[PDB]
Amino acid sequence: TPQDLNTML
Amino acid sequence: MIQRTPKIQVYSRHPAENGKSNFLNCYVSGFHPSDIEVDLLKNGERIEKVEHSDLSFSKDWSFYLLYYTEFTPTEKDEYACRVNHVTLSQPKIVKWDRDM
Amino acid sequence: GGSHSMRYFYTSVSRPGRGEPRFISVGYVDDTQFVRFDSDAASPREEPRAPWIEQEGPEYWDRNTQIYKAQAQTDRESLRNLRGYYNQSEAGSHTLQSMYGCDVGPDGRLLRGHNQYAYDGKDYIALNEDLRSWTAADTAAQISQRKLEAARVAEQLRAYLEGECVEWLRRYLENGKDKLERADPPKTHVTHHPISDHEATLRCWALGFYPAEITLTWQRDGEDQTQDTELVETRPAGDRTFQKWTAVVVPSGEEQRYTCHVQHEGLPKPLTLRWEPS
Amino acid sequence: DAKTTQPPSMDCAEGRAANLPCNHSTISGNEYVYWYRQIHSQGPQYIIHGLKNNETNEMASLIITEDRKSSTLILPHATLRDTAVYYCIVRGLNNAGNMLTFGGGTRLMVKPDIQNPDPAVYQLRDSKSSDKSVCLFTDFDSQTNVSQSKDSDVYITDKCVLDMRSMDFKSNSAVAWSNKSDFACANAFNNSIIPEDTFFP
Amino acid sequence: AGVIQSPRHEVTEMGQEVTLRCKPISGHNSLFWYRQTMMRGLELLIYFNNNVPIDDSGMPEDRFSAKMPNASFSTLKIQPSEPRDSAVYFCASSLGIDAIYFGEGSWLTVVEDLKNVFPPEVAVFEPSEAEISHTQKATLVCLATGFYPDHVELSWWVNGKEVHSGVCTDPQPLKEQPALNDSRYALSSRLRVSATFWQNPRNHFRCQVQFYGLSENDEWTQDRAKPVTQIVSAEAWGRAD
């Protein structure tokens, strides 16, 4: 299952 | 930000036996960026219902794709893979060599 | 080794003069892909690419679809931010790749976590092995680093990598037991191709093996020969198995001088073999 | 989703420690315990949070049990400003759980120390010379409950705590009024709100 | 600074478009919109993270739209407002997994009809001489009555300066006609001073009620003065009597 995050750079 | 040229292998899924159903594969790997054009050809003609794997990439970030189709190798039919990429001044045409 | 790994690979490609970038995600357990997501689809959704993942209920697919969609719009933000950091123009296409996941041991316990990013094919920023710090490639990456440190993203990632990653990997390994705990040994054989009246090619073949890791070596008189050898990259057969071969050029006779050695998991002991002619 | 449970209400004496319990038996390992409080017509106010270790700050101390299945917020010296609704909230470390989901909370009432109760009901006249008046029940001890009236024509405020800094003096109070002709301060709160030893001038 | 929200008060006739604005704390990358009513308490309407809407399951299915065009600005809009939309809308933000911090809120009353809006009447009730004799203290009581809706802020002003010591104001206004939908509100406050301070006729006491109502730029066809946002006060002087 994918990480439940939407990290931004 | 540099770019990487595709490595191309053209090969059958199983050892080629003329007259027996098989799969023809064009594996492109090690390239960057991801926009790439890949066609399988029988005697110079584009094979129609060619499929490809989902875009993925290696630990060094370079992409790879398997293009494949069912086919029946024969003694004289010529199969090749055409690849165009931003690193190529001319599209490459790699002929299928059943010994490779 | 009796260990396992799970990995997600994201590719976002910006599209200048147009709208949202292209976002693609794929997930693997070891060398077996099991999911995919493509923003280009009509109604994009996470989709199964292996038998043992179709068992998951629709909560799985809805949740992961939402995760990928949010990631795609965020990657769009990241791409225009990075374009700003480097002072690049609006005309060109650019790529942001992410790859993350977890390596666990035979006990199912975590051995290593990963979460790293590349921009236009180049290492941009990576979570260090301690899962608590970052390594940036350049000064732009340090802008990103200050953002990630302020938001404490490393602790979120450590939660995921020590938590959902290992648990879901153990679940997958149990559900696809046959297909993921297997180790298919390579069917191996040597062929001969005369190129002259004294020169020839001696090719050692490994077919049908899993996983992809393998080592082939040519040994002249039982001694490591690495001279005029050709070694092609390991390649997918398309049936979830792999293929590889290595070739050596050889003068006149003396073919029996040469031996090919094959190291692979599914093999009980390494394999030594020579050209058995007819 | 809400994972916490709390007692709906709790009373505390001014200057005494307030121990506010919270249960969260299904808490996960990637989930923090947060405590917020809300006064009246104000936005929720962060108090404190923690994962595994107990925590302290200027406002409170937070005790999380070893199995993490329950916790206690501790206000070590309640003041009148601590009267508010206190929310115990679980907050996870990913997007599914990053928002706060507010439950019932605990309505905490900080009761003032009334050293010298002097309960009385006074009549106050409008300064504008309109012959209107209000009734003021005041100086009663903090254990007195002011009930509302069943008559929609009689208005009785909740109890209100006044801090008179000019004399370091605190006092409870409630205000009643009504246009009803039979309404008088003698009967304004006699509605079982006042004990017999109330002073009626 | 903290979370900035505007407008703090909005009293507007149903059928209008309502826009609530929020500025998160500088550098915060997550933003939440919450609604608070009596029935359900605080409820998440929408959660943005890094400008991307993550969870809008709490948004009403119609008439409600939330936007985050840039990292330092978000709006909640209600396309045609309706009286049931009345509530307090809170904006909160956070920097990563640090604590979420809330704004002071936008208090929205969507009113069936502007003719329903009434400013308060204010009356100051002088201390009882029985209280003065019995305790040597003197309690003044302010009463604001007859106002609708219930956006009022009461304050006490002694000799021209706003005071806080010795004041207790009701936390919520009560209903004057608790059954009817016509119901105005009332609010009480107490200011308690020394008997000697009240007995000085030089001391001036003013109870002030700030009322949020119509904009000066609202339409109005009634005979009575437009019930605009305004202050209403009542006063009393001290008395040696």
Sketch out chain C's domains with CATH numbers.
4-181 (3.30.500.10), 187-273 (2.60.40.10)
User: Same structural domain for residues E72 and E125?
Assistant: no
The reply to whether residue C121 touches residue B27, judged by beta carbons under 8 angstroms, is no
Judge whether C238 and B23 are in contact, CB under 8 Å: yes
User: Same structural domain for residues E98 and E126?
Assistant: no
Find the helix packing angle between C164-175 and C153-162, rounded to 10°: 30
User: Same structural domain for residues E87 and E3?
Assistant: yes
After which residues are there C–N gaps above 2.5 Å in chain A? none
Judge whether D51 and D132 are in contact, CB under 8 Å: no
In chain C, which residues have their Cβ closer than 8 Å to the Cβ of A5? 153, 156-157, 160
Q: For residue D172, which of D164, D182, D160 has the smallest C-alpha distance?
A: D160
C-alpha–C-alpha distance, residues E90 and E87, integer Å: 10
User: Same structural domain for residues E138 and E215?
Assistant: yes
C-alpha–C-alpha distance, residues D157 and D149, integer Å: 10
Q: For residue D47, which of C204, E84, E101 has the smallest C-alpha distance?
A: E101
Burial class of residue E41, CB neighbours in 10 A (0-12, 13-18, 19+): middle
Name the phi and psi angles at E168, rounded to 5.
Answer: -140, 120
Pairing of strands C32-38, C47-48: antiparallel
User: Same structural domain for residues E88 and E195?
Assistant: no
Q: Which two tokens stand for residue D110?
A: 């900080």
Q: For residue B33, which of C14, C78, C95, C86 has the smallest C-alpha distance?
A: C95
Taking only Cα atoms into account, the Rg of chain A, rounded to an integer number of angstroms, comes to 7
Reduced to 3 states (helix: H, G, I; strand: E, B; else coil), residue C173 is: helix
In chain E, which residues have their Cβ closer than 8 Å to the Cβ of D101? 44
The residue written with tokens 């989709």 in the block is: C47
Which residues are within 8 A (CB) of E155 and not within 5 positions of it... i.e. 6 or more apart?
A: E162, E207, E208, E210
C-alpha–C-alpha distance, residues C94 and C14, integer Å: 5
Which residues are within 8 A (CB) of C58 and not within 5 positions of it... i.e. 6 or more apart?
A: none
User: Same structural domain for residues E127 and E209?
Assistant: yes
C-alpha–C-alpha distance, residues E141 and E189, integer Å: 6
C-alpha–C-alpha distance, residues C226 and C264, integer Å: 20
Tell me which residue range forms the domain holding E205. Answer: 113-241
User: Same structural domain for residues E4 and E56?
Assistant: yes
Final residue of a domain: which of E112, E136, E158?
E112
C-alpha–C-alpha distance, residues D158 and C205, integer Å: 90
Q: Which two tokens stand for residue D3?
A: 């994972």
Q: Which two tokens stand for residue E16?
A: 């209008």
Mutate to test the interface with E, among C12, C65, C68, C74 (most CBs of E within 10 A): C74
Is there an interface between A and B (3+ Cβ pairs < 8 A)?
no
Final residue of a domain: which of E64, E90, E112?
E112
Judge whether D124 and D66 are in contact, CB under 8 Å: no
C-alpha–C-alpha distance, residues E78 and E14, integer Å: 11
Torsional sign, CA E77, E81, E82, E88? positive
Give the number of A-D residue pairs with CB atoms closer than 8 Å. Answer: 7
The CB density around residue C86, as the number of other CB atoms within 10 Å, is 14
Please tell me the distance in Å from E81's CA to the nearest CA on chain D.
Answer: 22
Q: For residue E78, which of E20, E8, E123, E129 has the smallest C-alpha distance?
A: E20
D78 has which bridge partners? none
C-alpha–C-alpha distance, residues C205 and C135, integer Å: 41
The reply to whether residue C160 touches residue A3, judged by beta carbons under 8 angstroms, is yes
Reduced to 3 states (helix: H, G, I; strand: E, B; else coil), residue C64 is: helix
DSSP E173: P
Write the DSSP assignment of D76-87 as a string of letters. Answer: TT--GGG-EEEE
Name the phi and psi angles at E36, rounded to 5.
Answer: -125, 125
Final residue of a domain: which of E90, E112, E134?
E112
The residue ranges of every structural domain in chain D are 1-112, 113-201
Number of folded domains that form chain E = 2
C-alpha–C-alpha distance, residues D85 and D7, integer Å: 11
In chain E, which residues have their Cβ closer than 8 Å to the Cβ of C156? 96-97
C-alpha–C-alpha distance, residues D31 and D16, integer Å: 31
Tell me the C-alpha to C-alpha distance, in Å, between residue C80 and each of C14, C92, C119.
9, 11, 12
First to last CA, chain D: 56
Tell me the C-alpha to C-alpha distance, in Å, between residue E186 and each of E36, E153, E174.
22, 12, 5
Q: How many residues does chain A have?
A: 9
Resolution, Å (one decimal)? 2.2
C-alpha–C-alpha distance, residues E113 and E82, integer Å: 11
Angle CA(D42)–CA(E15)–CA(E181) in degrees, nearest 5?
Answer: 65
The reply to whether residue D94 touches residue C156, judged by beta carbons under 8 angstroms, is yes
Preceding peptide of C21 cis, ω within 30° = no
In chain C, which residues have their Cβ closer than 8 Å to the Cβ of B68? 238
The CB density around residue E83, as the number of other CB atoms within 10 Å, is 12
Pairing of strands D84-92, D106-111: antiparallel
Q: For residue E154, which of E213, E225, E207 has the smallest C-alpha distance?
A: E207
Please tell me the distance in Å from D164's CA to the nearest CA on chain E.
Answer: 4
Is C191's Cβ below 8 Å from some Cβ in A?
A: no
C-alpha–C-alpha distance, residues C188 and C105, integer Å: 29
Burial class of residue E193, CB neighbours in 10 A (0-12, 13-18, 19+): buried
Q: Which residue of chain D has the CA closest to C162?
A: D30
Angle CA(E180)–CA(E184)–CA(E186) in degrees, nearest 5?
Answer: 125
User: Same structural domain for residues E101 and E117?
Assistant: no
C-alpha–C-alpha distance, residues D175 and D155, integer Å: 8
User: Same structural domain for residues E190 and E238?
Assistant: yes
Q: Which two tokens stand for residue C178?
A: 């046959």
User: Same structural domain for residues E21 and E105?
Assistant: yes
In chain D, which residues have their Cβ closer than 8 Å to the Cβ of E88? 41
Q: Please indicate the experimental technique that yielded this structure.
A: X-ray
